[PDB]
Design a protein around this ligand. Structure first.
Ligand SMILES: [Zn+2]
Lengths: 48, 146, 215, 92, 49
């Protein structure tokens, strides 16, 4: 999920901003790149 | 009389104007000056680089110095051969810097954090650490591996 | 000499830029127009018609705003004055202290000229509620935090502190520390036992953060 | 100055004479001096502006070149050159 | 000559970093239980595997 600062959730904005960090981004970026990799192969089927 | 400085600083041993990157140009300077030549008008000092990290600690300090020392270690060791990997380098520079001052690995600098007298008298020392710990009546603990 | 003098008025003007943007990130209230001016407006304001600049008239005053007085419950406006001659002594530092006396606030800050001597060091850290700060004109030209390697250093209140210790369940101190009188430390004016969150970027997983306290 | 006195042939050193006079003599032997002492050891681009250089000249034509100097916010410094004399000139 | 010099470098480098480990809190800590770093390499992945 998301944790903003100390003991508080953020809402629908700072997700892109990400000034709050809290790390764990190594786990997020892995799922991201893995998803877009399948997308790149999927959009390749489109042009084909 | 034909000695004393008319202009410039009392630092630089010599300088060079070299071709930077593909077609560009820039200069490299040999000296301890740093900030003063960065403060020197006519050049943008935003993006620069300097060796001998210890002195970089005297200007930028701490973090920026730790980022510089892991930058040089990786560089020179990525040329001659093989790979040391990015992981093992970052931990080496972190354990040195984390105290807030760059020091270590030398008998004069090896005593910073560790309060254990036996392991310090193990690596390098003989007489002093045994009598010094008796004088000040140290206690500490037996914790570490060695 | 017209040449070397215009070098110094550009220096001080850029030095005025440094001390300006510095007071902004502390939470104090200014605007983007305050820190940003060309050479034109600078020559009119603080420089006479004779062509020689001034010193004491550069002094100004600024306060905090909104969250700055919310996050940190104890704080307020300050009073900044400049120096006169490179030689430092009792002199105008007396009335400077006096200026702090009746006008209260928190920390009077003053920029040096050239040399510092133990005379002016007679009393640096005075008064019971607060203290002051010392800065050199030489050392201040461009900001260090904005330079190259130095990343964003985020100061936090006592709230976030105790919560951070409730995360990993840790005793106080014992964290990676940060020395004081350090050019970065004194820049933001950190006191004893103040945790500053540091966001650094190097390439492995890319962006990640770590916490460093201040001794 | 590395001089020498005849006869003995050792050296000559400056000695302060009484009441305003400066002299020199060889050490531990009679002699007198000085005479006067001396030693010695060892273009396409063009613009229109008024030329400050004046003999009879008062030249109209001039040269210029453009580059950014000092701070980024710091204005442009221009260099001027004259056709006739070929004098370099610098002002911001 | 290089053979004799090989032993000095690595050794003295060891005695500093000799005692270090990784707890179940994922934070790498020392023998004094001080935390030098919150996460290893900013990732936590081992280069061995
Ligand atoms: Zn003679």
């Amino acid at each position: 999920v998301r944790y903003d600062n100390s003991g508080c959730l953020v809402k629908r904005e700072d997700l892109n901003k990400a000034e709050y960090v809290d790390q764990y981004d190594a786990e997020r970026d892995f799922y991201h790149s893995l998803r877009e990799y399948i997308n790149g192969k999927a959009t390749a089927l489109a042009n084909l | 009389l034909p000695d004393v400085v008319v202009k410039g600083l009392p630092d630089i041993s010599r300088a060079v104007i070299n071709i930077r990157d593909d077609g560009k140009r820039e200069l490299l300077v040999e000296g301890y000056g740093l900030r003063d030549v960065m403060c020197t008008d006519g050049v943008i000092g935003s993006r620069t680089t300097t060796n001998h990290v210890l002195e970089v600690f005297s200007v930028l300090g701490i973090e920026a110095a730790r980022y510089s020392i892991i930058r040089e270690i990786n560089y020179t060791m990525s040329n001659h051969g093989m790979s040391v990997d990015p992981r093992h380098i970052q931990l080496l520079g972190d354990v040195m810097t984390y105290k807030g001052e760059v020091l270590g690995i030398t008998r004069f600098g090896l005593s910073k954090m560790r309060d254990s007298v036996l392991q310090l008298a193990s690596f390098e020392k003989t007489t002093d650490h045994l009598f010094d710990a008796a004088f000040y009546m140290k206690k500490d603990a037996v914790e570490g591996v060695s | 000499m017209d040449q070397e003098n215009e070098r110094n008025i550009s220096r001080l003007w850029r030095a005025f830029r440094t001390v300006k943007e510095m007071v902004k990130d502390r939470g104090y209230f200014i605007t983007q127009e305050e820190v940003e001016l060309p050479l034109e407006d600078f020559k009119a304001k603080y420089c006479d018609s004779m062509g020689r600049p001034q010193r004491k008239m550069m002094s100004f005053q600024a306060n905090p705003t909104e969250e700055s007085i919310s996050k940190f419950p104890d704080m307020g406006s300050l009073w900044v004055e400049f120096c006169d001659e490179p030689s430092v002594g009792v002199k105008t530092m007396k009335t400077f202290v006096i200026h702090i006396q009746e006008k209260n606030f928190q920390t009077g800050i003053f920029v040096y000229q050239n040399n510092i001597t133990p005379s002016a060091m007679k009393l640096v850290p005075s008064i019971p509620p607060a203290t002051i700060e010392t800065f050199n004109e030489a050392a201040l030209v461009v900001n260090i935090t904005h330079h190259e390697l130095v990343p964003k250093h985020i100061r936090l209140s006592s709230d976030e502190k105790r919560e951070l210790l409730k995360r990993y369940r840790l005793k106080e101190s014992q964290l990676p520390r940060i020395q004081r009188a350090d050019p970065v430390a004194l820049y933001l004016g950190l006191k004893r036992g103040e945790v500053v969150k540091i966001i650094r970027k190097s390439e492995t997983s890319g962006r990640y953060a770590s916490y460093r306290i201040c001794m | 100055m590395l001089s020498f006195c005849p006869s003995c042939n050792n050296m000559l050193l400056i000695t302060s004479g009484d009441s305003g006079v400066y002299t020199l003599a060889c050490r531990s032997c009679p002699y007198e001096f000085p005479i006067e002492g001396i030693e010695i050891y060892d273009n396409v681009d063009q613009t229109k502006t008024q030329c400050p250089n004046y003999d009879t000249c008062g030249g109209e034509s001039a040269y210029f070149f453009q580059l950014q100097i000092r701070s980024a916010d710091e204005p442009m410094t221009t260099f001027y050159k004259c056709v006739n004399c070929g004098h370099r000139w610098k002002e911001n | 000559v290089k053979t004799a010099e090989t032993g000095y470098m690595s050794r003295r480098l060891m005695k500093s970093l000799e005692d270090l480990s990784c707890q179940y809190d994922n934070t790498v800590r020392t023998s004094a239980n001080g935390i030098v770093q919150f996460t290893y390499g900013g990732d936590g992945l081992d280069p061995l595997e």
